[PDB]
Amino acid sequence: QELGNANFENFIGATEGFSEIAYQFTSHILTLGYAVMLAGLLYFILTIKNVDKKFQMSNILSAVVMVSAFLLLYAQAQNWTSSFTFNEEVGRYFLDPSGDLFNNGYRYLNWLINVPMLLFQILFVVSLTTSKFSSVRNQFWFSGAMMIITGYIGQFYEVSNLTAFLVWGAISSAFFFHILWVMKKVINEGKEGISPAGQKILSNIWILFLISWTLYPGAYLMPYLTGVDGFLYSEDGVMARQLVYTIADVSSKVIYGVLLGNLAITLSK
Amino acid sequence: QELGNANFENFIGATEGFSEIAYQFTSHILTLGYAVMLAGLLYFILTIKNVDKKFQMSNILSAVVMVSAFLLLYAQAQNWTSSFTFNEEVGRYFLDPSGDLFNNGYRYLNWLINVPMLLFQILFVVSLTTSKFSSVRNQFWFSGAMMIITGYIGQFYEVSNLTAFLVWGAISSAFFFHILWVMKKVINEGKEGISPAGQKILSNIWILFLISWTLYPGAYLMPYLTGVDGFLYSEDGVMARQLVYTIADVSSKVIYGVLLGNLAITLSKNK
Amino acid sequence: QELGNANFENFIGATEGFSEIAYQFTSHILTLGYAVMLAGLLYFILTIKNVDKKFQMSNILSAVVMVSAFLLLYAQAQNWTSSFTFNEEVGRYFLDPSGDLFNNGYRYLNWLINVPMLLFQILFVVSLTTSKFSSVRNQFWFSGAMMIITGYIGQFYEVSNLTAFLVWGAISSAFFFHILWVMKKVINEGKEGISPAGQKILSNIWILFLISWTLYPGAYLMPYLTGVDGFLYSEDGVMARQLVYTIADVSSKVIYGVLLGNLAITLSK
Amino acid sequence: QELGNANFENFIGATEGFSEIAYQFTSHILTLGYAVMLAGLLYFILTIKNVDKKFQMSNILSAVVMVSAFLLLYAQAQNWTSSFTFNEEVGRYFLDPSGDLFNNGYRYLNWLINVPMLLFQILFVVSLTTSKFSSVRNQFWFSGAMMIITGYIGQFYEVSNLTAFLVWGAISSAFFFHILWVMKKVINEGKEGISPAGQKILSNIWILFLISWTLYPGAYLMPYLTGVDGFLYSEDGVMARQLVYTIADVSSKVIYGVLLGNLAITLSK
Amino acid sequence: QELGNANFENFIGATEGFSEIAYQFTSHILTLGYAVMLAGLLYFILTIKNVDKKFQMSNILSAVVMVSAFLLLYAQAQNWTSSFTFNEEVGRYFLDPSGDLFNNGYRYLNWLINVPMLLFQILFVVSLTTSKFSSVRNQFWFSGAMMIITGYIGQFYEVSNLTAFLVWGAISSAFFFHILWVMKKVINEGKEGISPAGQKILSNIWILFLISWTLYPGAYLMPYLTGVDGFLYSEDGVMARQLVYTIADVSSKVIYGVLLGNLAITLSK
Ligand SMILES: *C/C=C(C)/C=C/C=C(C)/C=C/C1=C(C)CCCC1(C)C
Ligand SMILES: *C/C=C(C)/C=C/C=C(C)/C=C/C1=C(C)CCCC1(C)C
Ligand SMILES: *C/C=C(C)/C=C/C=C(C)/C=C/C1=C(C)CCCC1(C)C
Ligand SMILES: *C/C=C(C)/C=C/C=C(C)/C=C/C1=C(C)CCCC1(C)C
Ligand SMILES: *C/C=C(C)/C=C/C=C(C)/C=C/C1=C(C)CCCC1(C)C
Ligand SMILES: CCCCCCCCO[C@@H]1O[C@H](CO)[C@@H](O)[C@H](O)[C@H]1O
Ligand SMILES: CCCCCCCCO[C@@H]1O[C@H](CO)[C@@H](O)[C@H](O)[C@H]1O
Ligand SMILES: CCCCCCCCO[C@@H]1O[C@H](CO)[C@@H](O)[C@H](O)[C@H]1O
Ligand SMILES: CCCCCCCCO[C@@H]1O[C@H](CO)[C@@H](O)[C@H](O)[C@H]1O
Ligand SMILES: CCCCCCCCO[C@@H]1O[C@H](CO)[C@@H](O)[C@H](O)[C@H]1O
Ligand code: NA
Ligand code: NA
Ligand code: NA
Ligand code: NA
Ligand code: NA
């Protein structure tokens, strides 16, 4: 079957199909994804007034991120269920093209909107020392956009053209390392002038940031992390990828937002 | 028909099918489930300001639990209606695979999110004495996650492999007993220093907790509680399970949340 | 056709079918039903602060009842439109089993949730004199549940077994009369100690309560109220039942809630 | 094809069909309808505290009207798109009975709910002089209900029985003229005692009321306003009717609500 | 086949079809569109109280624009997914007429509602000097309506009749130039008497306004901007148009709204 520039989920769906566990787990984990975002939305709105006026923009940005993210993750979950249909005869779920092909692009577009705001929002809680607010913001916004856009292009080729896949991924990675570099600077400068309690939370924010953000490129590469015809080029790789994306998105948005809010409270007088 | 690692609802649906009463009641009770969660959401938001600032995080946690739970229970209800279709010829509802197989996993994922928050939220109303807040929290969160994850794995095998079903269920039970142990400690320490009215509510919270949480393993086992080819391995067992899950979820979240809110009011200087 | 323990709507749908007027009116009236509930939700939230803090729980309870009532009535409306499909050849709507059979149980489960809260909520506005608060509450909650549960069982048999239908209905009625008895007591005791304006509203609340609550058993019996092969065992009876249920639910929840709120305002100082 | 007591939209759909422009425009205008209602809902909620406490019930009533209006108008829009399907062979949209017949009754039921509230709400902004509040309210509510109910019955016969159509329409019109009479009285009495700025707005409210409310009977009659086999008994008449209903509903609810809010501000210390 | 007066998306869909990238990207970008509107809605509501009472109407107008716009863009995204279905044999998405033809009219009707409010809302933040408030408002509202209505008519003919397409587009352009002229006047008069900070933001508002609003006519013409049988008369032109519309709508509403809110803050005592 000709699928063209399609995600590997479709190729697994079109050949081996998905077992009950593989199909149901992916449906469940993706549903958890958007459910957590809407739960987070309520949390962030309800806790806005827990911090001083000057910190509240960060709480507002956390809630705004939850909107977008809930709608895009909900669309991603519907895309998974509509793309794969039970075959009575073999008792597995196969590609149902009439529901459209499955594409991870809904999730990517959530990143496009939300990355700029997640990077931006910490600048409302911490004070920089050396760096100018507008400079850091502009670096975050440019590199954030380019990281997501180049990755979005790459992932269309993850089966149809491994070279394009890896080149676009590599370019994306460059922008990723730039963001990590700037965010480390922001964390360090944020630490000077604030209580030891505040410094501890910023340490935790950095570890959360580093682990959660590194998951994404892992999920990008997931199908190929065990090489050609590896364990992970399979329904097991599909499950692994969608779990990791869901953990990443929950961690990078909700937990991140909670930690920033807790920092804002400690700095609040 | 090969169904593989599927819930027993599908096997009943695929052989005997469901009577009008069995099918409609399950649809109704599952719908009640998500409707109560959204009603609860409004209640908890609207009553935030009925308690002192320091208690209000518990009300917020109750509302956050209602969100997740409404979406997952709504998805669980849609899964039931889509999976079973009326046959004109025999006048019963049979497995319609085109709607996907029915799986209770939507409900389980609601547990994964919400158990950590339900255990956590009492620590914002009561004061511990001897135990450290961070220690109790960490015990709740680790054991809560492991309980739900191991159960989630088990329930895929509830027909296809009785051994896996019962071993994963047993491991889940171990973590369950750990949580009961810690929650008893938390209740006892919570009772010290507070009015007799407050102590009465905490007693009631503990009974509600113990009964409501014990329903879950009952619902897990439901199809087999009358042995091989028993009364409950049937549409009657399907009805029983989905009723018990719905009662449990309403009790463990909404009533629990209401009792905690009533405790918060008694401990409030406004009262 | 084999329909088993199914509501009489399906039997009419399966034999005579529904005319355009019968089908459209039922769809419209059921839609009005859930629309009024969501309108009520907004009204009750927006008017919370029109009464003293000590009355506001009644306003909150009215809003909570609307949320469950809107969701269940909306589901009941979809059940109607999905269950009956236009036949081009005869120009009438017939049972389409693929949409599931039509059952009034969605409405009944709204009663199960909401009856306990409607009875309870008046105890936050009025003061009892002779009766104990916990006793009245317990009587309301026990009898409310038993009334709706026994009715819910009965209505499955409204065609398949007239005897079961009428026995379960009779048991339901007993619990109904108990509730009427207690509510009369509560109204009377509520009247003592309060302004004549407040007493007048409580008089009106009692008339509304008595008429609105009596409609339900009428709607239960509707198909048979003109005997065997009567005018009402027909699309006209289907229309009559769904109108009466909709009027009852609007009256017993929304108008009831408005009157209680107006009482709360008069008692507000 | 026998359609029975069905709206003329179905007869056009079943014979000539609808062009792309006719079908898409109707879908768009009906969508605009419910979108404006939800936009209005937010406006009215957000502006509640712009007026004195004693005027705020009018703002609340405007918001409550929007909730019913959005749900019913949304249902009316879905009824349109579901009822008419593209035919590849002729490139026109034809009646698809599987989606149900199209009926304007969803809109009518929005009137049933909302007319009583729109008439009522002005009595919270203006003071009567000679007329009794309870008398005006009761006249509005009785005549409002009878106007909508009689029209609702009439419109089922707009093709199948022109006599019934026009008699029910005529009866509806009588109640309409009664409402116009009472509302004129209410406007005049409202003008006494208030600033010239307030009087100007009440003049505008009367013109808006008179034009917007007169559109409805025009839309009722639309298909026949060019006589037998006229220009308007056609997809052009369908477009014209649905445009006029949408303009009327937006004017009579949203603009009306805005003008009343502006009056409330004028009368506010 | 016969598509009649239909958008060029359908003609591409009906002949060449859409590749996975072309179809998925359009679905993603249109989804991003409505997601950003709902994220914006939350931002504007949550920041209302950041400005003086007298500026807050502008913040409220930004939120009201977000409602309409979210619903219309959401409908536009659904229209795209239901209109184009995967063909297993060739592995491309082709016109599925059963989902209705695709039409950009949902977006146009969002313009009809929202243009009048976007133009109006700046008059609540700036003070005019020479020009009269009522005159500017009336010019905006008349020309805004005529611009959108004439464009809406034109776009039906964008394949079926190039002459009608370009004449209606030209008339639309005339009203566009009128609006640009008046808005420049409003910006200039707004700048007189206010802080340098205020003047800077108004300069930025003008550049954003000019670029964002100019994108629309570009998107209108997109399929023909590379002439007969050009690169852009293709799935690439479909992608280009829907990207530009989405960027325009986000820029002209959300960014515009943020800048106006920031202006309101600087002018706030
Ligand atoms: C809430 C969403 C967030 C924080 C998203 C983060 C996304 C990334 C850090 C993505 C990184 C990627 C690479 C470094 C290479 C491959 C492509 C990406 C976009 C997945
Ligand atoms: C809000 C939902 C709650 C409180 C969920 C509670 C879930 C349990 C206590 C589950 C217990 C289980 C066992 C002890 C064994 C079998 C598997 C489980 C997960 C059902
Ligand atoms: C908002 C919902 C309310 C107040 C529901 C009330 C329901 C009843 C009073 C039902 C009464 C019934 C009987 C007395 C006999 C037949 C069965 C019932 C449940 C319809
Ligand atoms: C918000 C909705 C409003 C204000 C609805 C108004 C409806 C009317 C004034 C209807 C009038 C009619 C007649 C006078 C004759 C024909 C039937 C009606 C109902 C369309
Ligand atoms: C949020 C929506 C906005 C600001 C919409 C703006 C729309 C335009 C400026 C449209 C302009 C057009 C022309 C000048 C010619 C072709 C037709 C139009 C309507 C696209
Ligand atoms: C950084 C990780 C780089 C991964 C190296 C690319 C491995 C390419 O392996 C690919 O695996 C597929 C499934 O097994 C095969 O179908 C492809 O033919 C093969 O190219
Ligand atoms: C601790 C709970 C008791 C578990 C007892 C497991 C014995 C169940 O036995 C099972 O019953 C099913 C239904 O009748 C049959 O289909 C299976 O063949 C049979 O293995
Ligand atoms: C208190 C009201 C109870 C009245 C019971 C009357 C018995 C109804 O009689 C039933 O009517 C049906 C249709 O008319 C028939 O099909 C049934 O054969 C018949 O049992
Ligand atoms: C405003 C009152 C106008 C009533 C005039 C009714 C005359 C219309 O007459 C009707 O027109 C239909 C379509 O043209 C025909 O199909 C019908 O046969 C005809 O009865
Ligand atoms: C601003 C641009 C003005 C419009 C340019 C006129 C070009 C019209 O060219 C058109 O291009 C289509 C696709 O190539 C062809 O299918 C049409 O038949 C042709 O009329
Ligand atoms: Na599926
Ligand atoms: Na079903
Ligand atoms: Na139907
Ligand atoms: Na259609
Ligand atoms: Na599609």
Side-chain angles (χ1 to χ4, degrees), chain D residues 148-169:
Chain D
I148 297 322
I149 287 163
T150 55
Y152 179 72
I153 291 162
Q155 57 96 26
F156 276 115
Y157 298 107
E158 73 182 29
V159 173
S160 66
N161 188 336
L162 258 106
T163 299
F165 178 56
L166 289 179
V167 166
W168 282 120

PDB file of all heavy atoms in Angstrom, chain D residues 148-169:
ATOM      1  N   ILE D 148     -45.990  32.735  19.967  1.00  0.00           N
ATOM      2  CA  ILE D 148     -44.953  31.762  19.508  1.00  0.00           C
ATOM      3  C   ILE D 148     -45.622  30.404  19.266  1.00  0.00           C
ATOM      4  O   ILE D 148     -45.322  29.775  18.232  1.00  0.00           O
ATOM      5  CB  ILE D 148     -43.787  31.654  20.512  1.00  0.00           C
ATOM      6  CG1 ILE D 148     -43.025  32.974  20.664  1.00  0.00           C
ATOM      7  CG2 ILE D 148     -42.856  30.516  20.125  1.00  0.00           C
ATOM      8  CD1 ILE D 148     -42.865  33.754  19.379  1.00  0.00           C
ATOM      9  N   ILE D 149     -46.491  29.965  20.181  1.00  0.00           N
ATOM     10  CA  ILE D 149     -47.149  28.627  20.117  1.00  0.00           C
ATOM     11  C   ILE D 149     -47.991  28.551  18.837  1.00  0.00           C
ATOM     12  O   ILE D 149     -47.886  27.537  18.122  1.00  0.00           O
ATOM     13  CB  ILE D 149     -47.981  28.344  21.382  1.00  0.00           C
ATOM     14  CG1 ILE D 149     -47.087  28.050  22.588  1.00  0.00           C
ATOM     15  CG2 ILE D 149     -48.967  27.212  21.135  1.00  0.00           C
ATOM     16  CD1 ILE D 149     -47.796  28.164  23.918  1.00  0.00           C
ATOM     17  N   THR D 150     -48.789  29.583  18.556  1.00  0.00           N
ATOM     18  CA  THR D 150     -49.735  29.605  17.409  1.00  0.00           C
ATOM     19  C   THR D 150     -48.926  29.646  16.108  1.00  0.00           C
ATOM     20  O   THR D 150     -49.316  28.945  15.154  1.00  0.00           O
ATOM     21  CB  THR D 150     -50.746  30.753  17.531  1.00  0.00           C
ATOM     22  OG1 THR D 150     -50.052  31.991  17.682  1.00  0.00           O
ATOM     23  CG2 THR D 150     -51.697  30.568  18.692  1.00  0.00           C
ATOM     24  N   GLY D 151     -47.845  30.431  16.079  1.00  0.00           N
ATOM     25  CA  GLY D 151     -46.904  30.494  14.944  1.00  0.00           C
ATOM     26  C   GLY D 151     -46.229  29.151  14.710  1.00  0.00           C
ATOM     27  O   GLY D 151     -46.104  28.743  13.539  1.00  0.00           O
ATOM     28  N   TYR D 152     -45.810  28.486  15.790  1.00  0.00           N
ATOM     29  CA  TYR D 152     -45.128  27.167  15.764  1.00  0.00           C
ATOM     30  C   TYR D 152     -46.041  26.143  15.087  1.00  0.00           C
ATOM     31  O   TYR D 152     -45.553  25.360  14.259  1.00  0.00           O
ATOM     32  CB  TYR D 152     -44.757  26.722  17.179  1.00  0.00           C
ATOM     33  CG  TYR D 152     -44.075  25.379  17.250  1.00  0.00           C
ATOM     34  CD1 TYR D 152     -42.770  25.219  16.818  1.00  0.00           C
ATOM     35  CD2 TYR D 152     -44.733  24.264  17.742  1.00  0.00           C
ATOM     36  CE1 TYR D 152     -42.134  23.990  16.878  1.00  0.00           C
ATOM     37  CE2 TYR D 152     -44.112  23.027  17.809  1.00  0.00           C
ATOM     38  CZ  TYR D 152     -42.806  22.889  17.375  1.00  0.00           C
ATOM     39  OH  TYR D 152     -42.177  21.678  17.433  1.00  0.00           O
ATOM     40  N   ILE D 153     -47.329  26.149  15.436  1.00  0.00           N
ATOM     41  CA  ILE D 153     -48.357  25.250  14.835  1.00  0.00           C
ATOM     42  C   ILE D 153     -48.490  25.604  13.350  1.00  0.00           C
ATOM     43  O   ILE D 153     -48.386  24.692  12.514  1.00  0.00           O
ATOM     44  CB  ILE D 153     -49.697  25.351  15.590  1.00  0.00           C
ATOM     45  CG1 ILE D 153     -49.590  24.760  16.999  1.00  0.00           C
ATOM     46  CG2 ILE D 153     -50.820  24.702  14.791  1.00  0.00           C
ATOM     47  CD1 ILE D 153     -50.693  25.200  17.939  1.00  0.00           C
ATOM     48  N   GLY D 154     -48.673  26.890  13.046  1.00  0.00           N
ATOM     49  CA  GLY D 154     -48.893  27.397  11.679  1.00  0.00           C
ATOM     50  C   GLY D 154     -47.836  26.910  10.702  1.00  0.00           C
ATOM     51  O   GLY D 154     -48.214  26.508   9.584  1.00  0.00           O
ATOM     52  N   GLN D 155     -46.556  26.966  11.087  1.00  0.00           N
ATOM     53  CA  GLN D 155     -45.403  26.883  10.147  1.00  0.00           C
ATOM     54  C   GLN D 155     -45.249  25.439   9.646  1.00  0.00           C
ATOM     55  O   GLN D 155     -44.572  25.242   8.617  1.00  0.00           O
ATOM     56  CB  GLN D 155     -44.120  27.394  10.807  1.00  0.00           C
ATOM     57  CG  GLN D 155     -43.745  26.660  12.089  1.00  0.00           C
ATOM     58  CD  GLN D 155     -42.736  25.559  11.865  1.00  0.00           C
ATOM     59  OE1 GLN D 155     -41.944  25.589  10.923  1.00  0.00           O
ATOM     60  NE2 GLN D 155     -42.761  24.568  12.742  1.00  0.00           N
ATOM     61  N   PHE D 156     -45.864  24.474  10.339  1.00  0.00           N
ATOM     62  CA  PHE D 156     -45.915  23.043   9.943  1.00  0.00           C
ATOM     63  C   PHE D 156     -46.754  22.891   8.669  1.00  0.00           C
ATOM     64  O   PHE D 156     -46.576  21.890   7.943  1.00  0.00           O
ATOM     65  CB  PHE D 156     -46.459  22.182  11.090  1.00  0.00           C
ATOM     66  CG  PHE D 156     -45.420  21.776  12.104  1.00  0.00           C
ATOM     67  CD1 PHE D 156     -45.484  22.232  13.412  1.00  0.00           C
ATOM     68  CD2 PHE D 156     -44.367  20.948  11.748  1.00  0.00           C
ATOM     69  CE1 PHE D 156     -44.519  21.866  14.337  1.00  0.00           C
ATOM     70  CE2 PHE D 156     -43.403  20.582  12.675  1.00  0.00           C
ATOM     71  CZ  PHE D 156     -43.482  21.041  13.967  1.00  0.00           C
ATOM     72  N   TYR D 157     -47.633  23.861   8.396  1.00  0.00           N
ATOM     73  CA  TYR D 157     -48.670  23.772   7.334  1.00  0.00           C
ATOM     74  C   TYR D 157     -48.321  24.711   6.174  1.00  0.00           C
ATOM     75  O   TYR D 157     -49.139  24.847   5.245  1.00  0.00           O
ATOM     76  CB  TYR D 157     -50.055  24.037   7.929  1.00  0.00           C
ATOM     77  CG  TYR D 157     -50.452  23.033   8.978  1.00  0.00           C
ATOM     78  CD1 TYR D 157     -50.465  23.371  10.321  1.00  0.00           C
ATOM     79  CD2 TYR D 157     -50.765  21.727   8.635  1.00  0.00           C
ATOM     80  CE1 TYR D 157     -50.804  22.447  11.296  1.00  0.00           C
ATOM     81  CE2 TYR D 157     -51.106  20.790   9.598  1.00  0.00           C
ATOM     82  CZ  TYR D 157     -51.124  21.150  10.934  1.00  0.00           C
ATOM     83  OH  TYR D 157     -51.459  20.240  11.894  1.00  0.00           O
ATOM     84  N   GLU D 158     -47.127  25.312   6.204  1.00  0.00           N
ATOM     85  CA  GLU D 158     -46.755  26.440   5.307  1.00  0.00           C
ATOM     86  C   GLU D 158     -46.764  25.969   3.846  1.00  0.00           C
ATOM     87  O   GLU D 158     -46.821  26.834   2.956  1.00  0.00           O
ATOM     88  CB  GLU D 158     -45.417  27.051   5.726  1.00  0.00           C
ATOM     89  CG  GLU D 158     -44.202  26.201   5.407  1.00  0.00           C
ATOM     90  CD  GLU D 158     -42.887  26.810   5.874  1.00  0.00           C
ATOM     91  OE1 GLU D 158     -42.903  27.554   6.877  1.00  0.00           O
ATOM     92  OE2 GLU D 158     -41.845  26.551   5.230  1.00  0.00           O
ATOM     93  N   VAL D 159     -46.742  24.655   3.601  1.00  0.00           N
ATOM     94  CA  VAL D 159     -46.902  24.072   2.233  1.00  0.00           C
ATOM     95  C   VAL D 159     -48.179  23.222   2.180  1.00  0.00           C
ATOM     96  O   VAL D 159     -48.916  23.348   1.188  1.00  0.00           O
ATOM     97  CB  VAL D 159     -45.665  23.258   1.802  1.00  0.00           C
ATOM     98  CG1 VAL D 159     -45.895  22.533   0.484  1.00  0.00           C
ATOM     99  CG2 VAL D 159     -44.422  24.130   1.718  1.00  0.00           C
ATOM    100  N   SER D 160     -48.418  22.387   3.196  1.00  0.00           N
ATOM    101  CA  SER D 160     -49.395  21.265   3.164  1.00  0.00           C
ATOM    102  C   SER D 160     -50.828  21.806   3.250  1.00  0.00           C
ATOM    103  O   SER D 160     -51.751  21.087   2.831  1.00  0.00           O
ATOM    104  CB  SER D 160     -49.120  20.269   4.267  1.00  0.00           C
ATOM    105  OG  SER D 160     -49.335  20.852   5.545  1.00  0.00           O
ATOM    106  N   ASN D 161     -51.015  23.017   3.786  1.00  0.00           N
ATOM    107  CA  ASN D 161     -52.361  23.600   4.041  1.00  0.00           C
ATOM    108  C   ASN D 161     -52.251  25.113   4.266  1.00  0.00           C
ATOM    109  O   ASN D 161     -52.097  25.533   5.432  1.00  0.00           O
ATOM    110  CB  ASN D 161     -53.041  22.924   5.228  1.00  0.00           C
ATOM    111  CG  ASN D 161     -54.480  23.362   5.400  1.00  0.00           C
ATOM    112  OD1 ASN D 161     -54.860  24.449   4.965  1.00  0.00           O
ATOM    113  ND2 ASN D 161     -55.283  22.528   6.040  1.00  0.00           N
ATOM    114  N   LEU D 162     -52.350  25.896   3.190  1.00  0.00           N
ATOM    115  CA  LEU D 162     -52.107  27.362   3.198  1.00  0.00           C
ATOM    116  C   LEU D 162     -53.111  28.048   4.129  1.00  0.00           C
ATOM    117  O   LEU D 162     -52.742  29.070   4.737  1.00  0.00           O
ATOM    118  CB  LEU D 162     -52.214  27.907   1.772  1.00  0.00           C
ATOM    119  CG  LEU D 162     -50.877  28.178   1.089  1.00  0.00           C
ATOM    120  CD1 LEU D 162     -50.584  27.123   0.032  1.00  0.00           C
ATOM    121  CD2 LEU D 162     -50.860  29.571   0.481  1.00  0.00           C
ATOM    122  N   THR D 163     -54.328  27.511   4.237  1.00  0.00           N
ATOM    123  CA  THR D 163     -55.426  28.088   5.057  1.00  0.00           C
ATOM    124  C   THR D 163     -55.032  28.036   6.537  1.00  0.00           C
ATOM    125  O   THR D 163     -55.022  29.104   7.174  1.00  0.00           O
ATOM    126  CB  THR D 163     -56.757  27.372   4.788  1.00  0.00           C
ATOM    127  OG1 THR D 163     -57.067  27.566   3.409  1.00  0.00           O
ATOM    128  CG2 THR D 163     -57.894  27.881   5.649  1.00  0.00           C
ATOM    129  N   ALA D 164     -54.729  26.843   7.058  1.00  0.00           N
ATOM    130  CA  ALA D 164     -54.238  26.617   8.439  1.00  0.00           C
ATOM    131  C   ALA D 164     -53.032  27.525   8.704  1.00  0.00           C
ATOM    132  O   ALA D 164     -53.012  28.199   9.748  1.00  0.00           O
ATOM    133  CB  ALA D 164     -53.882  25.164   8.631  1.00  0.00           C
ATOM    134  N   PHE D 165     -52.071  27.532   7.776  1.00  0.00           N
ATOM    135  CA  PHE D 165     -50.848  28.373   7.803  1.00  0.00           C
ATOM    136  C   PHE D 165     -51.221  29.826   8.131  1.00  0.00           C
ATOM    137  O   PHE D 165     -50.591  30.429   9.019  1.00  0.00           O
ATOM    138  CB  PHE D 165     -50.117  28.265   6.462  1.00  0.00           C
ATOM    139  CG  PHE D 165     -48.876  29.111   6.344  1.00  0.00           C
ATOM    140  CD1 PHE D 165     -47.846  28.994   7.263  1.00  0.00           C
ATOM    141  CD2 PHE D 165     -48.738  30.024   5.312  1.00  0.00           C
ATOM    142  CE1 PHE D 165     -46.704  29.772   7.152  1.00  0.00           C
ATOM    143  CE2 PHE D 165     -47.594  30.798   5.200  1.00  0.00           C
ATOM    144  CZ  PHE D 165     -46.581  30.672   6.121  1.00  0.00           C
ATOM    145  N   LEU D 166     -52.213  30.372   7.423  1.00  0.00           N
ATOM    146  CA  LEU D 166     -52.528  31.826   7.408  1.00  0.00           C
ATOM    147  C   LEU D 166     -53.448  32.166   8.585  1.00  0.00           C
ATOM    148  O   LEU D 166     -53.326  33.281   9.122  1.00  0.00           O
ATOM    149  CB  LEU D 166     -53.175  32.192   6.068  1.00  0.00           C
ATOM    150  CG  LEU D 166     -52.238  32.183   4.860  1.00  0.00           C
ATOM    151  CD1 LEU D 166     -52.994  32.528   3.583  1.00  0.00           C
ATOM    152  CD2 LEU D 166     -51.071  33.137   5.062  1.00  0.00           C
ATOM    153  N   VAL D 167     -54.322  31.238   8.983  1.00  0.00           N
ATOM    154  CA  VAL D 167     -55.249  31.414  10.141  1.00  0.00           C
ATOM    155  C   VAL D 167     -54.425  31.452  11.432  1.00  0.00           C
ATOM    156  O   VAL D 167     -54.583  32.417  12.207  1.00  0.00           O
ATOM    157  CB  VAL D 167     -56.322  30.309  10.192  1.00  0.00           C
ATOM    158  CG1 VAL D 167     -57.038  30.288  11.534  1.00  0.00           C
ATOM    159  CG2 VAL D 167     -57.323  30.445   9.054  1.00  0.00           C
ATOM    160  N   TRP D 168     -53.586  30.437  11.654  1.00  0.00           N
ATOM    161  CA  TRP D 168     -52.661  30.350  12.817  1.00  0.00           C
ATOM    162  C   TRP D 168     -51.729  31.571  12.827  1.00  0.00           C
ATOM    163  O   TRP D 168     -51.503  32.131  13.910  1.00  0.00           O
ATOM    164  CB  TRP D 168     -51.878  29.032  12.788  1.00  0.00           C
ATOM    165  CG  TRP D 168     -52.659  27.846  13.266  1.00  0.00           C
ATOM    166  CD1 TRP D 168     -52.961  26.722  12.553  1.00  0.00           C
ATOM    167  CD2 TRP D 168     -53.235  27.657  14.572  1.00  0.00           C
ATOM    168  NE1 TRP D 168     -53.680  25.848  13.323  1.00  0.00           N
ATOM    169  CE2 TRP D 168     -53.869  26.395  14.564  1.00  0.00           C
ATOM    170  CE3 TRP D 168     -53.285  28.426  15.740  1.00  0.00           C
ATOM    171  CZ2 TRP D 168     -54.542  25.893  15.678  1.00  0.00           C
ATOM    172  CZ3 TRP D 168     -53.949  27.928  16.840  1.00  0.00           C
ATOM    173  CH2 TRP D 168     -54.570  26.679  16.806  1.00  0.00           C
ATOM    174  N   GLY D 169     -51.220  31.967  11.658  1.00  0.00           N
ATOM    175  CA  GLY D 169     -50.378  33.167  11.484  1.00  0.00           C
ATOM    176  C   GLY D 169     -51.117  34.430  11.892  1.00  0.00           C
ATOM    177  O   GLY D 169     -50.505  35.284  12.566  1.00  0.00           O
TER     178      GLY D 169
END
